[PDB]
């Protein structure tokens, strides 16, 4: 379908969400005050993908921002980007989650769960074109991993046939913001794969590299990192937002990008990376994008895929791009680098030409695939999950809520099984 709800949760969800709508509104042109600026058919016949034609032609997106920290929304509705969101969608309350996966929903967070379902239910009725639910949060974040994970299960009961897209941000196994980041991530996957259908891997540490290597940025910031993720979220939708020679869809992804059920983790990869200053000495062409998409340095997951093995890649070129420009370049990668692609697929390529182009560039393309090296990202969380809590440290905070030690052990056994799924299915 076309009408899709973009749910937001967690301290990072609203941040990435603010930059998300900032880019979506720039494509078809839409002022933050809700004024129409499309030119014209392509920027008018596909405006209901996220907005609604309210009174006086005032367009407002469909997003339910939820968080237990009222101090976060204050820095959005007050400053720029605020008139778009409707005040009735704001659902916030005191105090907070406490940077823990238990209290985030198992106790305190269970109070607002009844209010979030009420707003999402009413919007679902009026929207005669529901398809899925786009969620953006952190895998180890407090309100993101706790209240965000439980929300996926509630929506799964009332919307089983509907899809469920998530943009979780994996932790950094080197520069962690909080010591209780890996622990909260072990419990989020316990219910994520048991409800959601597709989840993208994002790592902030992997962004600082491309920001200083390609973009040539010395001091990145959260305001800039969200732009990179916004380009990915806005890329897997152009087919549904604008016509093209081969319009893909979120459903077509799982039918191809997901071989077997127990495998929802993807590896994003936007391209080309516009280098500040060094963008004029380049030639935007398809052969140049293929060399950057498959580059292990541009991964945002970002385990080295060369060490592992690809499964089903996918590209979404934009702008002035033909059909053979991709089928040829993408096919050459299947020969010289055949050792990295498995044979039982067998075709390891998937295209989806669009029509329009992103603002500021003449052509763009993303990269999404399932590499066998994703298991490495889970081993880092599994080792820290057990090596740190081997002596029962920082565990009384979670057991005091009500969860028993048995509940935390089952979460580790599931992750250990996922690592084996990538060997059956030999690497």
């Amino acid at each position: 379908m076309r009408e899709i709800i973009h749910i937001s949760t967690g301290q990072c969800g609203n941040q990435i969400g603010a930059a998300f709508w900032e880019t979506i509104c720039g494509e078809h042109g839409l002022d933050f005050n809700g004024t129409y600026h499309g030119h014209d058919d392509i920027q008018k016949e596909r405006l209901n993908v996220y907005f609604n034609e309210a009174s006086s032609g005032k367009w407002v997106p469909r997003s339910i921002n939820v968080d237990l920290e009222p101090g976060t929304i204050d820095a959005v509705r007050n400053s720029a980007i605020g008139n778009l969101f409707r005040p009735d969608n704001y659902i916030f309350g005191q105090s907070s989650a406490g940077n823990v996966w238990a209290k985030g929903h198992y106790t305190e967070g269970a109070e607002l769960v009844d209010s979030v379902m009420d707003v999402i239910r009413r919007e679902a009725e009026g929207c005669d074109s529901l398809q899925g639910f786009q969620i953006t949060h952190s895998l180890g974040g407090g309100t993101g991993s706790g209240m965000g994970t439980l929300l996926i299960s509630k929506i799964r009961e009332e919307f089983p046939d509907r899809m469920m897209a998530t943009f979780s941000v994996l932790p950094s196994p080197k520069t962690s913001d909080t010591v209780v980041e890996p622990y909260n991530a072990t419990l989020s996957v316990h219910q994520l794969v048991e409800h959601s259908d597709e989840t993208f891997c994002i790592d902030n540490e992997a962004l600082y590299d491309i920001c200083q290597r390609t973009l040539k940025l010395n001091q990145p910031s959260y305001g800039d990192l969200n732009n990179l993720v916004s380009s990915v979220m806005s890329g897997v939708t152009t087919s549904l937002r604008y016509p093209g020679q081969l319009n893909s869809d979120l459903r077509k992804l799982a039918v191809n990008l997901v071989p077997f059920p127990r495998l929802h983790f993807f590896m994003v990869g936007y391209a080309p990376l516009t280098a500040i200053g060094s963008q004029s000495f380049r030639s935007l062409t398809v052969p140049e994008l293929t060399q950057q998409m498959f580059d292990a340095k541009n991964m945002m997951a970002a385990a080295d895929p060369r060490n592992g093995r690809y499964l089903t890649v996918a590209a979404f070129f934009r702008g002035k791009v033909s059909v053979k420009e991709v089928e040829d370049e993408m096919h050459k990668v299947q020969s010289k680098n055949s050792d990295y692609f498995v044979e039982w697929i067998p075709n390891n390529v998937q295209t989806a030409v669009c029509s329009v182009a992103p603002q500021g560039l003449d052509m763009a393309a993303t990269f999404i695939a399932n590499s066998t090296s994703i298991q490495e990202l889970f081993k880092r969380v599994g080792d820290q999950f057990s090596a740190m809590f081997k002596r029962k440290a920082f565990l009384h905070w979670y057991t005091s809520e009500g969860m028993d030690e048995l509940e935390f052990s089952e979460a580790e056994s599931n992750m250990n099984d996922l690592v084996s799924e990538y060997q059956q299915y030999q690497e």
């Binding site: 379908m1 398809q131 020679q245 869809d249 799982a254 039918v255 059909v323 039982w344 697929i345 390529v349």
Partner: protein, 440 residues
Amino acid sequence: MREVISINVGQAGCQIGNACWELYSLEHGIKPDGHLEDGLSKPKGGEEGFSTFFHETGYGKFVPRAIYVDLEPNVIDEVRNGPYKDLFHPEQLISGKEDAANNYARGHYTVGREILGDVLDRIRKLADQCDGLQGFLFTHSLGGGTGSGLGSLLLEELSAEYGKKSKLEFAVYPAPQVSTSVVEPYNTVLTTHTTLEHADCTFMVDNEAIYDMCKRNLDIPRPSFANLNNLIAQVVSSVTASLRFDGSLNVDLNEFQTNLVPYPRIHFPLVSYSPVLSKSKAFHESNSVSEITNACFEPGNQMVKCDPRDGKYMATCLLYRGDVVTRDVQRAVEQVKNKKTVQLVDWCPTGFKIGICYEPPTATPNSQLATVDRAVCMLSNTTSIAEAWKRIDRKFDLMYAKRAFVHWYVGEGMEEGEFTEAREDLAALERDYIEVGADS
């Protein structure tokens, strides 16, 4: 016989159909709005044909008897916002809503069945308007399941509905070396069963082969589906040519059943087409039908990724358009037989259906293929064909062995036994198809 109804299913099918209708209106002097313009001669719009493709209007706004079927609104919207908006009755543009994705379990069933009631009644009303109704002409893809699976159901329904009209089916196949969809072997193989048992004559087109021709014969640096489809449209228009225009040797649509189909099965002719000349060359070029005829056997003009030289000759058809002498094409054929390529099997012993249509070829402004005063369309049941089946069957095998993607079909109305049976029928065809050539 007289009438023919066109059916487009899925995006690729619709895109190709667009090209065909553009082309047909060009040939008959019909403007983008219909009406008329003028419509005209002998037999431009008509005199008969039309009506053959276009429905007569008491105003002159002629209406293409075409039905567009899709599950994705976007494709049809393109059509509805295109320059040919006025060539279609709006109620012939059967827009869907929720896609079947990719797809067959939904396409031939859980989603597709929800619009067929409308589709079939559309057809029935149209068919009642028609006289004779010699056949239906399907245009679709065997890649995505809407074109494959939905198209399949619709085909079946018309064989049940009538079962006596000619069922043509122009099907686009996956290139053996490259494709845009991972589960395509399932979406293709799962329908070989039904096209086998419900189409009377299928055509197999490979995009890759055509792209080769575009890059090489037409000198195209950057091919496009628009160009590719224009080529296909021209091929389709010739099938067909003598059902609209005057010809020395007129070919009935049923003619192909009589000439190309020796057994109930085997109905999968290859197409080839020439002259394919870029505008830059059509000055140096100037030739006889004997040379054009040679080009038709040349692998470079096959529009299908297989080796006709490997295969043996079963019945074939050479349709000619424009300024063509019947003696000369007989001479040309004789010379071709003497090449001893596509060894003529004893079973024919020769079987060259010659069709001679007086109407010169034409190209729309969207094609850079030069217009010519004569052209040739070739059809053939040459035994090279089973290799295409083998290719896709190996892809099917690897996947199915691990199952993997089977999940997406079984989980929504299917059974693994169905996948097994589809494979078995395909395998059976490879065998039978080989045996009738293998014997001599």
